[PDB]
Enzyme design. Structure first.
Site, PDB file in Angstrom:
ATOM      1  N   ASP A 147       0.597  -0.908   0.034  1.00 13.57           N
ATOM      2  CA  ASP A 147      -0.275  -0.305  -0.073  1.00 13.57           C
ATOM      3  C   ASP A 147       0.787   1.494  -0.157  1.00 13.57           C
ATOM      4  O   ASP A 147       2.343   1.159   0.690  1.00 13.57           O
ATOM      5  CB  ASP A 147      -0.870  -0.332   1.531  1.00 13.57           C
ATOM      6  CG  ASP A 147      -2.549   1.180   0.932  1.00 13.57           C
ATOM      7  OD1 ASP A 147      -2.120   1.633   0.035  1.00 13.57           O
ATOM      8  OD2 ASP A 147      -2.632   1.755   1.867  1.00 13.57           O
ATOM      9  N   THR A 201      -4.383   4.266  -4.170  1.00 11.42           N
ATOM     10  CA  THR A 201      -3.134   5.485  -3.032  1.00 11.42           C
ATOM     11  C   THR A 201      -1.556   5.373  -3.559  1.00 11.42           C
ATOM     12  O   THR A 201      -0.980   5.998  -3.786  1.00 11.42           O
ATOM     13  CB  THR A 201      -3.710   4.328  -1.383  1.00 11.42           C
ATOM     14  OG1 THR A 201      -4.388   4.136  -0.995  1.00 11.42           O
ATOM     15  CG2 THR A 201      -2.167   5.935  -0.405  1.00 11.42           C
ATOM     16  N   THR A 202      -1.204   4.368  -4.782  1.00 13.07           N
ATOM     17  CA  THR A 202      -0.162   4.325  -4.956  1.00 13.07           C
ATOM     18  C   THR A 202      -0.663   5.629  -6.680  1.00 13.07           C
ATOM     19  O   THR A 202       0.784   6.167  -6.438  1.00 13.07           O
ATOM     20  CB  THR A 202       0.085   2.960  -5.989  1.00 13.07           C
ATOM     21  OG1 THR A 202       0.012   1.680  -4.893  1.00 13.07           O
ATOM     22  CG2 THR A 202       1.517   3.294  -6.000  1.00 13.07           C
ATOM     23  N   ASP A 247      -7.979  -2.731   1.905  1.00 17.37           N
ATOM     24  CA  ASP A 247      -8.221  -2.426   0.357  1.00 17.37           C
ATOM     25  C   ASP A 247      -9.292  -3.206  -0.274  1.00 17.37           C
ATOM     26  O   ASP A 247     -10.513  -2.945  -0.922  1.00 17.37           O
ATOM     27  CB  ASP A 247      -6.963  -2.370  -0.253  1.00 17.37           C
ATOM     28  CG  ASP A 247      -5.846  -1.895   0.841  1.00 17.37           C
ATOM     29  OD1 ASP A 247      -7.091  -0.850   1.227  1.00 17.37           O
ATOM     30  OD2 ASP A 247      -4.523  -2.446   0.176  1.00 17.37           O
TER      31      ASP A 247
END
Ligand code: ADP
Ligand code: ADP
Ligand code: ADP
Ligand code: MG
Ligand code: MG
Ligand code: MG
Lengths: 527, 541, 191, 550
Positions: D65, D98-99, D404
Site C-alpha cells: 500500500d 493510493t499509489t 483494501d
C-alpha cells in the site's frame, strides 16, 4: 582444518568502489549534465549574462563563452566532462558556439528522459538521432548560398560575419570601431598559411578599450635594459632590423673553459683576447648599419654602451613566439653568426616610434605594408576587461579564419535550427514507427536555441514560437528573431550571417556527446 | 559458555591468512560472487552493448565496452576473478579479438555447472568432461566453414572481415571506419602479382593519430604520419623539388664530443682568436657535404644545437626532433632509409625518397604531415581520427587495434577462415554436442550436456540488449534449424525482429575460426582452473 | 624485513660484487644496472671541482643562474664564501672549500672577498657562508662559532652539507659513512 | 540536480536557517517528489513488485500500500509531507488508488515545473488544470456503465479481482472473491431511514499462520480472539438458542470509592464488612447466573471470586478485550451493551431482554490460539475472516490487502455505476482533453496539453513493470481510443473500443468485460481533485524559509 575462528567474505570490487545497476545511474548522469546545462542556459544570446568563477587559488576570471568556464571548474563526474570535452573541441576546431553545443547536447539528453522512462532501451533512440543528423547536415548544405553569384566585394564579407561574433559581449556597442581592427588584421595574413600564433594580444593594463590602435607592425615590451637605455634615439626614420640567436655574453652560459697559462706576458694577451673577441663581433654588426638589433638570448652590458654610442637600438630576452612574429614582418630569417651576415637579410620599416601606455613602454614598428602578420594592443579598465575582450576578438578572428577557407552563408538567430527541425518533422510522418517519436524529440530539442534568446530578452516564448510555426508552414528562409525592432522579420534584410561550420560541428558534437553517455548504464569510480 | 576456545590451531598461520576451503562452501561462494562481474561483460556484449566508465586511482577516465581494457584497471581483491582477468589479457596480446566471448563463456561454464556440483558429481570428472568436449569442439568447427578465402588482397573482400569487427564496437559507424581500416591495409600490403611465403605483418604498422574536434565523416587516410610538433626555420616549397631525400641520424648534429667529460684548454691567446672560427669551420666541413647531395630534410633524435640549426636555415633544410625512439624508426619505413648514428656523408643507397611535406592545422594545433603520392611504401599507414571528445576517440583506437590485430591473426597463420556469425554456429554446436553425449555412455554424460547449455548466452544476449523476449525468439530459432539454408540462420536485431529470422549474406556478418578456437580453449582452461581449486589462501592486505 | 634490503641498499657497485657467488645473478645484476645508472648521472652532473674565485658583475650570474641549473628541476647548490683575509676563520673556511671541491664535484663552491661583495659590510660578521638553490637562499650562515669556531674540522663541514640537502645521509663519500679499510678488516675477522 | 549551495547573505539577516529563492526551490521540491515517487513506482499493478523496510529492531514490513510505505518513511522535507498525509487521507476515505494519486501528483509537478520554465505563470497553469478537471469529471459521467443482465454476484466478484490483484493473494483471487463479497452482505444494516451503509472494519482478522491461504475457512458469524478465563470451563456449548450476555461491568473483589474512609469503634464489624464488601459483587453475578447466561461477555475484568461462581454452573468466562468488538456482538446476537447494570425503579435487577441469541458457540484452536467462534446469530448476521499464511509478516500483508479489498467492494455497493480500469480512463481523458481547448486557442492549449500527457504515466508505469515493450502498447491504446472518440455515434465496433485497453498478463489487447477488469466510479472521483490540491500546494511555492530549532 581452518586457520582461525572465522573467515569474512571477500568483496569483489575494492573497498570504497562505487557501483550501481539499473536505470537510476543513467538518469543521474543525464541530470548531472542538465545541472551543468542550467549554468549556461541564461548565458546564450546577445542579452545573456556573464559568469564569474573563482577557483581555489583566488584568481578572478570572468568569461561569457563556455570554453574557459568549464576549464576553470574542475569536473569530477565523467558524464559532465562530456560537455567540457566538446566545448574545448569546438573551441579548438571552430571557435564559436561553445555554449550552444552544450545546450543542444543537454537538451537531447533532457528529451531522452521520458523515452528512457519507457521500456525503449537506449539503442533505439541512438539510432534515431544518428539517422536525423545524416539529413540535418545535408539540409544545412542545401540551404548554403554562395556569395560569388552576386559578385559582391570581399572586404565587406568579413565585416558582415564578424558583426555576429561581437554580440553577447562588452563590444556590441563599440563594434563599429573594433570590427575594422580584426578584419584588417586577418587580411594581412597569407590566405594559404593562416596561423593562430601571429595574432598574440598583450594583456597591457591601463586605458580605455576605444583608445587602442591597429598597426601592421609588432611590439614587444621593453625588456631588462641594462644601463645604456634612454640614451639612444627612440624614433627612427628607416631603421634596419637585425635578429641574432647567438648569446652576446662574456662567458655567461658558455661551458667553463679551463684556461692554463705559464707566462706573465701571455697573461696580458689572454685577458685582452676576451675584449678582442667581443669587439670583433660588435664591429662586424656595426659595418652593416643594423639600427635595431634583437635577440632571444640576453645581450651583454658592454654591447649596450657600444650600441648607445653609434645610436643603434638594442633589446634582448625576447620570447620565441614573439620573435617568430617579428621575422614574418621584417623579412629575412635569423642568423647566429656575425661574420655570415648580409645586407639582404635585414628588414626595414617606414616609421618607428616608442611610446608609453599604462606605464609600460612598448617599441612599435609602423608602416609595414609587406608584413604578413599583425598585432593588437587592447587597452582596458581592469584585468578581466582586457582578457574578456582579448578572447572575444580571438573568437571574432576565428570566424573570419574559417570564412576565408570556405564561403558559405547560413541563417542565424535560431532560424537554421527550425528549418532543419520542420524538415525532419516532414520526414518523420512517413516513418510510422518508433523512430517517428524520436525524430520529433530531436526536432523539439533543436527548438531550444530560439527559447533562450527570448527568455533572456524578457519576451514570452510560447507566443512568439507559435508565430514562427505558423510562418514556417510556407516556404521561407532567413526567418528568425531580432531584438532591435522587437518584432520578427527577414534576417537577410536585417543583414546577419554566420558560417555553416558552426552549425554542422555543433550538431555532430552535440549528438556525439549525447550518444557517448546514452551508450552506457553505469559509472564506476575506484578509491 | 561465553568465549570460544578460539580454534587451537591459532598457533599456526597468522590472522591475516584466510582459508576458504570446500565442504565449507568455497565453490558456492565463488561461482556466485563472480555473477556480478559476469553481468558486466554480458551487458557490454553485442552491437547494442553498453560501454562502462572506469576511473582508475590516478584519475585517467576510460570508457570501453570490452573486457581486457576494463579488468586491467579494476583492482579486484577476489583471487578467483583474477584467473579470468589475465586469461582475457592473453586474448588481447595474442589475437586481439574475443575478450567478451571469453568472459561470457568462462563465467557461464562455472554458472551452468552449479547443477553438476549441487547434484553431487565429482569435480575430477567434470574436468575430464570439458576436456573431451573441448577436443570435439575443435574438430567439429572445421566442417562448418563456408568462407575459405585465398585472395586476401583486395579491399572489397575485407568487407566480410573488418566490418563485422567494427559493427560490434559502436554499430552506428560501419562504412566510414571500415573504409579507413581497409584503405590502410591496402597501403600496408605491397603491390605485387603474387605475394606469398607468409609475408610479414605487425600491429605497429597501422598507427592512430588522435586529433581533437571534427566529425567522424571528415576523417581521411594518410600514408605517412602526423606529429604534434612545431617546425623551425622556414616554410616549405610544396611542389618545387618534386621529391626530398630524408636522412635520419640517431646522434645529434653537433661537434663529436666524447662520453667522458672534457673542457677547453688554451695555453695562449693565439688559439683564443681561432676558437671562435674553428667551431664554425668544423661543422661547415661536415654540413657542406650533406647539402651537396641535396638532403632536403634531416631528423635528429637528440637535441639539435643552434649552431647546426643556423647553417641549415639558409639552405632550407627541414629539421625535426622526434625524441621518442619507438616512433623514430617508423618514419624510416616511410622514406625507406636506414638510421645513421655516424655523421659521415649521405650515400644514394641508404637515403630514401619522400614526395612532399606540408604544415597546417587540423584541429587548431600546428602539425607536420608526411603524406606522399606516387611513392613506394612498405608497412606504414595512419588513420587521422576526428571526434568531439577524447574519451570517445580512445575507444576508436582500441577498435582499430582489434581490427588490425585480426589482420595479424589471418596472415600470420596459414588460414584464418570465416564462420557464420550472429548466433548461427553457436546453436549448431549445441546440436552437435547434444548428439555427441549420447554416443559415449558413462557418468560423464551429464558434463557433456551442461557444456552445451553454456553456449546459450550468445544468442539471447543479443536479444536481451535488443529489448526482445528470450523465451520467444530463442526457441523459435531452433525450429529454423530443422532439416545449405539451415546453417545461415541467425539472430535479427531490428524493429521487424518478431519473426526472428534474418539471412546472414544480406549484411555479411562473419566471425574468425582461429579466434573462436583460442577463445574456447582459454575459456575452458579458465573454467578448468576454477573448478580444480578447492582451497584458497589469502594474506594480510 | 631489513635483512633482505641490506643486501642491495648497503653495498655500492664495488661491494655488490661480494654477493656474486652467494646471491642469484638476476637478483644482483638487476640492482647493479640500477646503481650503475646512478653513478653515470653523478658523472654528468660533475660540472665543478675547484673553487670559483669570482667577482661581482659575475655574481649576478654565477651564483644565481647556476642555482637554477637546467632551468626536469635540475637544481644546483652554490656555496658562497665572503672571504676576509684578516680573519682567522676565513682562511680555515677557504681550506674546507677546496677540500670539499675535490670530493663533491656536483656542488659548486664559490668564493669572493667580503669587501667586494656588499657595500660597507661589517667586518665583524665575516666570514659569511651563503647557500643558493634555484635562485633562493637556503641558509644565511653566520661566523663559525656554531661549527666549533676556531676548532672547526672537515667532519663538521660535511655534516652541515647534509642538513641543507646538498648531500645524502648515506653517501659513501662522507667521512661519517666512509669507514676505513682497516676498520672493516677488523669487523670481518671478529665476525 | 541542485549544486553549489546558496551563499550566506549579510544584507538579509534572519534568525535560524538561511533563505533560498529562485527556481532551485521548485527543482528541490520536484527532486523531493522523485525521492518518494520512484519508491512507489515499482509496486504498481499486478506485475509491480514491492520492497521491504526494517524497523531497526529486527522487525520489518513488506508493504504494497502507498499509505503504509509512506507512513514508515518519515519525510523530513516539507513538500514530501504533503504527499505523505495525502495517502493517509486517501486510504481512510476511499481505500483505493493510493499509489496512483501519488504518481499522478508527481507527474503533475514534473510537467508543471517544466511549464514554469517555459515562462507561463502558475496561476494560468492552475486555471488550465481546473477547467480541464471540470470537463474530466463531466466525461467520467459519460462513460459510466450500469450493471444489468448479470448472473448473480458476478459483478461484485470480478470487480474485487481488480483490487485483489497487485498483492500476494491475487493468485487465490478465485477463492477470496466469493468470501469477501459474502462477508459484506452479512453485515448489512439500515441507517438514516433507508440509506444502506456498512460499518468500518466490521469483519475481523485473526493471524493464524498454518495450513495455507487456499483453505481459509469462512465462518458465517462473529469471531473473537480471547483466552479462556478458567481451563476447567467447557469449550463447547451444545443445544440451540445459546444466550449471550454482553457487559462492561467489572466484577473483581471490588473496592469502595475514593472519598470513603471507614472508621469503626467495634472490633466485631470487620467480619461483616469484609464479607459484605465481597458479597456486594455476588448480588450482581447471582442474578445473571439464574437468568441462564450460558456464555457471558465482559470488557472490564472478572476475578477469582466471580470466576469460580461462574464455573459452578458451566458458564464460559471472558477476560480483557477491546471495547469496539463487544458492540457488534450485541448487534448480531441482539443483546444490549450495559455500561452499568441498574433500573429506573429503586431496586437493582436484571431483565431477560438484555440477552442475545445464537445457534452455536465453540472455542476452536487455530494451532496455538484460543478464539471463541460464534455462528448462527439471530438478530443480525455477521462474518469473520480467518487469514492463514506462511509467517506473520505475510499475515500482516494479508490484513491491509483485505482492508483494501473490503473497502473497494464497500464503495461499489454505495453507487451502482462503475467505470473500467486498466488505463482506459487515463487513455480516454488524454485524447479527450487534447481535443478540448482547440477552440480556446491562445495560452491554455499548452497547459492542458501537458496535463493530458501527465495522465499517460500510469499505462507507461504498468508496462515497464512487466519488462515488455511499452511503446507498442501505448501505440495501441491511444490510437484505438482516438479512433473511438472521433467515430460516428452509429458504429458499434468502434464505440466498443472506448471500452478496452492494456493487459499486463498476456501482453495483448482484450476486452475488459470478458477479462473482468473493473473499478468503481468513486475511486477516480475525488482522486484527481486530491492530486490537484497536492499539485497546487507545492506549485505556488516560490521561496523556502527554514527556522532552526531552539
Ligand atoms: N544580430 C543578431 N541577431 C539575431 N541573433 C543573433 C545576433 N547575434 C547573435 N545572435 C544569436 O545569438 C546566439 C548566441 O551567440 P553568442 O553567444 O554571442 O556566440 P557564442 O555562443 O559562440 O559565444 C547565436 O545562436 C546567434 O544565433
Ligand atoms: N548487423 C548485425 N546483424 C547480426 N549480428 C550482428 C550484427 N552486428 C554484429 N553482430 C553480431 O554481434 C556479435 C558481437 O561479437 P563480439 O563479442 O564483438 O566478437 P568477439 O567476441 O570476437 O570480439 C558478433 O558475433 C556478430 O555476429
Ligand atoms: N488484473 C488487472 N488487469 C489490468 N489492470 C489492473 C489489474 N489489476 C490492477 N490493475 C490496475 O492497477 C492499478 C493499481 O492497482 P492497485 O495496485 O490494486 O491499487 P493501488 O494503486 O491503490 O495500489 C489500477 O489503476 C488498475 O487499473
Ligand atoms: Mg560567439
Ligand atoms: Mg570483436
Ligand atoms: Mg489497490
Amino acid at each position: 582444518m581452518n586457520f582461525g575462528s572465522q573467515t569474512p567474505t571477500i568483496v569483489v570490487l575494492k573497498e570504497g568502489t562505487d557501483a550501481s545497476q539499473g536505470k537510476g545511474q543513467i538518469i543521474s548522469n543525464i541530470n548531472a549534465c542538465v545541472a551543468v546545462q542550467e549554468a549556461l542556459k541564461p548565458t546564450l544570446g546577445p542579452l545573456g549574462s556573464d559568469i564569474l568563477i573563482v577557483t581555489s587559488n583566488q584568481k578572478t576570471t570572468i568569461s561569457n563563452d563556455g570554453a574557459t568556464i568549464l576549464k576553470l571548474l574542475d569536473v569530477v563526474h565523467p558524464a559532465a566532462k562530456t560537455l567540457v570535452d566538446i566545448s574545448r573541441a569546438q573551441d579548438a576546431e571552430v571557435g564559436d558556439g561553445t555554449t550552444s553545443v552544450t545546450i543542444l547536447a543537454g537538451e537531447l539528453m533532457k528529451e531522452a528522459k521520458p523515452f528512457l522512462e519507457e521500456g525503449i532501451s537506449s539503442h533505439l533512440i541512438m539510432k534515431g538521432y544518428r539517422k536525423a543528423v545524416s539529413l540535418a547536415v545535408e539540409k544545412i548544405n542545401e540551404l548554403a548560398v554562395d556569395i560569388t553569384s552576386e559578385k559582391s566585394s570581399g572586404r565587406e564579407l568579413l565585416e558582415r560575419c564578424a558583426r555576429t561574433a561581437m554580440s553577447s559581449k562588452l563590444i556590441h556597442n563599440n563594434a563599429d570601431f573594433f570590427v575594422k581592427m580584426c578584419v584588417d588584421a586577418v587580411l594581412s595574413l597569407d590566405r594559404n598559411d593562416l596561423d593562430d600564433k601571429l595574432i598574440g594580444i598583450k594583456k597591457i593594463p591601463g586605458g580605455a578599450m576605444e583608445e587602442s590602435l591597429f598597426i601592421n607592425g609588432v611590439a614587444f615590451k621593453k625588456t631588462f635594459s641594462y644601463a645604456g637605455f634612454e640614451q639612444q634615439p627612440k624614433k627612427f626614420n628607416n631603421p634596419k632590423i637585425l635578429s641574432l640567436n647567438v648569446e652576446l655574453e662574456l662567458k655567461a652560459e658558455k661551458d667553463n673553459a679551463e684556461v692554463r697559462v705559464e707566462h706573465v706576458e701571455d697573461y696580458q694577451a689572454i685577458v685582452d683576447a676576451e675584449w678582442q673577441l667581443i669587439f670583433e663581433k660588435l664591429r662586424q654588426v656595426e659595418e652593416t648599419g643594423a639600427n635595431i638589433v634583437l635577440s632571444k638570448l640576453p645581450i651583454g652590458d658592454l654591447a649596450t654602451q657600444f650600441f648607445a654610442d653609434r645610436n643603434i637600438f638594442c633589446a634582448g630576452r625576447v620570447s620565441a613566439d614573439d620573435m617568430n612574429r617579428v621575422i614574418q614582418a621584417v623579412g629575412g630569417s635569423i642568423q647566429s653568426t656575425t661574420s655570415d651576415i648580409k645586407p639582404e637579410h635585414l628588414g626595414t620599416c617606414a616609421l618607428f616610434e616608442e611610446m608609453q601606455i599604462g606605464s609600460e613602454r612598448y617599441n612599435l614598428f609602423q608602416g609595414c605594408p609587406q608584413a604578413k602578420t599583425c598585432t593588437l594592443l587592447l587597452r582596458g579598465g581592469a584585468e578581466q576587461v582586457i582578457a574578456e575582450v582579448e578572447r572575444s576578438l580571438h573568437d571574432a578572428i576565428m570566424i573570419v579564419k574559417r570564412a576565408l577557407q570556405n564561403k558559405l552563408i547560413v541563417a542565424g538567430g535560431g532560424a537554421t535550427e527550425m528549418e532543419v527541425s520542420k524538415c525532419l518533422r516532414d520526414y518523420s510522418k512517413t516513418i510510422a514507427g518508433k523512430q517517428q517519436m524520436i525524430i520529433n524529440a530531436f526536432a523539439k530539442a533543436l527548438e531550444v536555441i530560439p527559447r533562450q534568446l527570448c527568455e533572456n530578452a524578457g519576451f514570452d516564448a510560447i507566443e512568439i514560437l507559435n508565430k514562427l510555426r505558423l510562418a514556417h508552414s510556407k516556404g521561407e528562409k532567413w526567418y528568425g528573431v531580432v531584438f532591435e525592432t522587437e518584432n520578427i522579420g527577414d534576417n537577410f534584410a536585417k543583414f546577419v550571417w554566420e558560417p555553416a561550420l558552426v552549425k554542422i560541428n555543433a550538431l555532430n558534437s552535440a549528438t556525439e556527446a549525447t550518444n557517448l553517455i546514452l551508450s552506457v548504464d553505469e559509472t564506476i569510480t575506484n578509491k | 559458555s561465553l568465549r570460544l576456545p578460539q580454534n587451537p590451531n591459532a598457533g599456526l598461520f597468522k590472522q591475516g591468512y584466510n582459508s576458504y576451503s570446500n565442504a565449507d562452501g568455497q565453490i558456492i561462494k565463488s561461482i556466485a560472487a563472480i555473477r556480478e562481474l559476469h553481468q558486466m561483460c554480458l551487458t557490454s556484449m553485442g552491437p547494442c552493448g553498453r560501454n562502462k566508465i572506469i576511473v582508475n586511482h590516478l584519475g585517467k577516465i576510460i570508457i570501453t565496452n570490452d573486457a581486457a581494457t576494463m579488468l586491467r584497471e579494476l583492482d579486484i581483491v577476489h583471487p578467483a576473478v583474477k584467473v579470468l582477468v589475465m586469461a582475457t589479457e592473453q586474448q588481447k596480446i595474442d589475437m586481439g579479438d574475443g575478450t567478451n566471448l571469453v568472459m561470457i563463456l568462462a563465467g557461464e561454464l562455472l554458472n551452468v555447472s552449479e547443477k553438476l556440483i549441487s547434484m553431487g558429481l565429482s569435480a575430477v570428472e567434470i574436468i575430464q568432461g570439458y576436456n573431451m568436449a573441448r577436443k570435439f569442439t575443435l574438430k567439429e568447427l572445421d566442417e562448418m566453414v563456408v568462407g575459405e578465402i585465398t585472395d586476401k588482397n583486395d579491399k572489397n573482400e575485407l568487407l566480410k572481415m573488418i566490418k563485422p569487427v567494427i559493427s560490434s564496437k559502436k554499430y552506428g559507424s560501419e562504412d566510414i571506419l571500415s573504409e579507413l581500416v581497409s584503405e590502410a591495409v591496402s597501403h600496408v600490403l605491397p603491390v605485387a602479382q603474387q605475394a606469398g611465403e607468409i609475408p610479414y605483418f605487425n600491429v605497429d604498422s597501422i598507427r592512430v593519430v588522435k586529433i581533437m574536434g571534427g566529425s567522424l565523416s571528415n576523417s581521411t587516410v594518410i600514408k605517412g604520419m602526423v606529429f604534434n610538433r612545431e617546425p623551425e626555420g622556414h616554410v616549405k616549397s610544396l611542389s618545387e623539388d618534386k621529391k626530398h631525400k630524408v636522412a635520419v641520424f640517431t646522434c645529434p648534429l653537433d661537434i663529436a664530443n666524447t662520453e667522458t667529460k672534457g673542457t677547453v684548454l688554451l695555453h695562449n691567446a693565439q688559439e683564443m682568436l681561432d676558437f671562435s672560427k674553428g667551431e664554425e669551420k668544423q661543422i661547415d666541413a661536415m654540413m657542406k657535404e650533406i647539402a651537396d647531395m641535396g638532403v632536403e630534410c634531416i631528423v635528429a633524435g637528440a637535441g639539435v644545437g643552434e649552431l647546426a640549426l643556423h647553417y641549415l636555415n639558409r639552405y632550407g633544410i627541414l629539421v625535426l626532433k622526434v625524441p621518442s625512439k619507438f616512433e623514430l624508426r617508423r618514419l624510416c619505413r616511410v622514406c625507406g632509409a636506414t638510421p645513421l648514428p655516424r655523421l659521415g656523408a649521405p650515400t644514394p643507397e641508404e637515403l630514401g625518397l619522400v614526395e612532399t611535406v606540408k604544415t597546417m592545422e587540423i584541429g587548431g594545433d600546428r602539425v607536420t604531415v608526411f603524406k606522399q603520392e606516387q611513392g613506394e611504401i612498405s608497412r606504414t599507414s595512419t588513420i587521422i581520427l576526428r571526434g568531439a571528445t577524447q574519451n570517445n576517440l580512445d575507444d576508436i583506437e582500441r577498435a582499430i587495434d582489434d581490427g588490425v590485430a585480426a589482420v595479424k591473426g589471418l596472415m600470420k597463420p596459414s588460414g584464418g577462415k570465416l564462420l557464420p556469425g550472429a548466433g548461427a554456429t553457436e546453436i549448431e554446436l549445441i546440436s552437435r554436442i547434444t548428439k555427441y553425449g549420447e554416443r559415449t555412455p558413462g557418468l560423464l554424460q551429464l558434463a557433456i550436456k551442461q557444456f552445451a547449455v553454456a553456449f546459450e548466452v550468445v544468442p539471447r544476449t543479443l536479444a536481451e540488449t535488443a529489448g526482445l523476449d528470450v523465451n520467444e525468439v530463442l526457441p523459435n530459432l531452433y525450429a529454423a534449424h530443422n532439416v545449405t539454408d539451415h546453417l545461415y540462420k541467425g539472430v535479427d536485431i531490428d524493429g521487424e525482429s518478431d519473426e526472428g529470422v534474418k539471412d546472414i549474406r544480406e549484411e555479411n556478418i562473419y566471425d574468425m575460426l582461429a579466434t573462436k578456437k583460442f577463445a574456447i580453449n582459454v575459456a575452458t582452461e579458465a573454467a578448468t582452473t576454477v573448478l580444480s581449486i578447492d582451497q584458497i589462501i589469502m594474506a594480510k592486505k | 624485513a631489513k635483512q633482505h634490503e641490506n643486501r642491495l641498499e648497503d653495498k655500492d657497485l664495488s661491494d655488490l660484487e661480494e654477493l656474486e657467488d652467494d646471491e642469484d645473478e638476476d637478483f644482483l645484476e638487476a640492482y647493479k644496472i640500477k646503481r650503475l645508472n646512478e653513478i653515470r648521472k653523478l658523472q654528468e652532473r660533475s660540472k665543478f671541482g675547484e673553487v670559483f674565485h669570482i667577482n661581482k658583475p659575475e655574481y649576478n650570474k654565477e651564483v644565481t643562474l647556476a642555482s637554477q641549473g637546467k632551468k626536469d628541476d635540475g637544481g644546483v647548490y652554490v656555496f658562497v664564501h665572503l672571504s676576509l683575509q684578516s680573519k682567522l676563520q676565513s682562511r680555515i673556511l677557504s681550506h674546507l672549500f677546496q677540500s670539499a671541491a675535490c670530493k663533491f664535484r656536483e656542488i659548486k663552491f664559490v668564493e669572493i672577498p667580503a669587501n667586494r661583495a656588499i657595500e660597507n659590510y661589517p667586518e665583524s660578521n665575516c666570514p659569511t657562508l651563503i647557500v643558493y638553490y634555484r635562485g633562493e637562499v637556503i641558509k644565511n650562515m653566520i661566523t663559525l662559532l656554531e661549527l666549533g669556531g676556531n676548532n672547526s674540522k672537515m667532519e663538521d663541514f660535511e655534516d652541515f652539507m647534509v642538513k641543507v640537502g646538498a648531500v645524502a645521509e648515506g653517501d659513501n663519500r662522507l667521512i661519517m659513512n666512509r669507514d676505513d679499510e682497516e676498520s672493516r678488516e677488523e669487523r670481518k675477522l671478529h665476525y | 540536480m541542485s549544486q553549489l549551495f546558496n551563499n550566506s547573505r549579510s544584507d538579509t539577516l534572519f534568525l535560524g536557517g538561511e533563505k533560498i529563492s529562485g527556481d532551485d526551490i521548485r527543482n528541490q521540491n520536484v527532486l523531493a517528489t522523485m525521492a518518494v515517487a520512484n519508491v512507489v513506482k515499482s509496486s504498481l499493478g499486478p506485475v509491480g513488485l514491492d520492497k521491504m523496510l526494517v524497523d531497526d529492531i529486527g522487525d520489518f514490513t513488506v508493504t504494497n500500500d502507498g499509505a503504509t510505505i509512506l507512513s514508515l518513511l518519515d519525510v523530513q522535507h516539507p513538500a514530501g509531507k504533503i504527499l505523505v498525509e495525502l495517502a493517509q487521507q486517501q486510504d481512510r476515505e476511499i481505500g483505493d488508488g493510493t499509489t496512483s494519486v501519488v504518481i499522478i501528483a508527481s507527474e503533475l509537478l514534473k510537467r508543471a515545473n517544466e511549464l514554469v520554465k517555459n515562462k507561463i505563470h502558475p496561476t494560468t497553469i492552475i486555471t488550465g488544470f481546473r477547467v480541464a478537471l471540470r470537463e474530466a469529471i463531466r466525461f467520467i459521467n459519460e462513460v459510466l456503465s450500469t450493471s444489468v443482465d448479470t448472473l448473480g454476484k458476478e459483478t461484485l466478484i470480478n470487480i474485487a479481482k481488480t483490487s485483489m490483484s497487485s498483492k500476494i493473494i491475487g493468485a487465490d483471487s478465485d477463492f477470496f472473491s466469493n468470501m469477501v463479497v459474502d462477508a459484506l452482505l452479512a453485515v448489512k444494516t439500515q441507517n438514516s431511514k433507508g440509506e444502506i451503509k456498512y460499518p468500518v472494519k466490521a469483519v475481523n482478522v485473526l493471524k493464524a499462520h498454518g495450513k495455507s491461504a487456499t483453505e481459509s475457512l469462512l465462518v458465517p458469524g462473529y469471531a473473537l480472539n480471547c483466552t479462556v478465563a478458567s481451563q476447567a470451563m467447557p469449550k463447547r456449548i451444545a443445544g440451540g438458542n445459546v444466550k449471550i450476555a454482553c457487559l462492561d461491568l467489572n466484577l473483581q473483589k471490588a473496592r469502595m470509592a475514593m472519598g470513603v474512609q471507614i472508621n469503626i469503634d467495634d472490633p466485631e464489624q470487620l467480619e461483616q464488612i469484609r464479607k459484605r464488601e465481597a458479597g456486594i459483587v455476588l448480588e450482581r453475578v447471582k442474578k445473571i447466573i439464574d437468568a441462564g447466561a450460558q456464555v457471558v461477555l465482559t470488557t472490564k475484568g472478572i476475578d477469582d471470586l466471580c470466576l469460580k461462581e461462574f464455573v459452578e454452573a458451566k458458564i464460559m468466562g471472558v477476560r480483557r478485550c477491546k471495547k469496539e468488538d463487544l458492540r457488534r456482538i450485541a448487534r448480531a446476537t441482539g443483546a444490549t451493551l450495559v455500561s452499568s447494570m441498574s433500573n429506573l425503579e429503586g431496586e437493582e435487577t436484571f431483565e431477560s431482554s438484555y440477552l442475545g441469541l445464537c445457534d452455536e458457540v465453540v472455542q476452536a484452536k487455530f494451532s496455538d490460539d484460543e478464539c471463541i467462534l460464534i455462528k448462527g446469530t439471530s438478530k443480525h448476521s455477521s462474518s469473520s475472516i480467518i487469514l492463514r499464511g506462511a509467517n506473520d509478516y505475510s499475515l500482516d500483508e494479508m490484513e491491509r490487502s483485505l482492508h483494501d479489498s473490503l473497502s473497494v467492494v464497500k464503495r461499489t455497493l454505495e453507487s451502482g455505476n462503475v467505470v473500467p480500469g486498466g488505463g482506459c480512463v487515463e487513455a480516454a481523458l488524454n485524447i479527450y482533453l487534447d481535443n478540448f481547448a482547440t477552440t480556446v486557442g491562445s495560452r491554455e492549449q499548452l497547459a492542458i496539453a501537458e496535463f493530458a500527457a501527465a495522465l499517460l504515466i500510469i499505462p507507461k508505469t504498468l508496462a515497464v513493470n512487466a519488462a515488455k515493450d511499452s511503446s507498442e502498447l501505448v501505440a495501441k491504446l491511444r490510437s484505438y481510443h482516438a479512433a473511438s472518440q472521433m467515430a460516428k455515434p452509429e458504429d458499434v465496433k468502434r464505440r466498443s473500443y472506448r471500452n478496452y485497453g492494456l493487459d499486463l498478463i498476456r501482453g495483448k489487447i482484450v476486452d475488459e468485460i470478458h477479462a473482468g477488469v473493473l473499478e468503481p466510479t468513486i475511486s477516480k472521483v475525488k482522486s484527481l481533485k486530491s492530486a490537484l490540491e497536492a499539485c497546487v500546494a507545492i506549485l505556488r511555492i516560490d521561496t523556502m524559509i527554514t527556522v532552526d530549532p531552539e
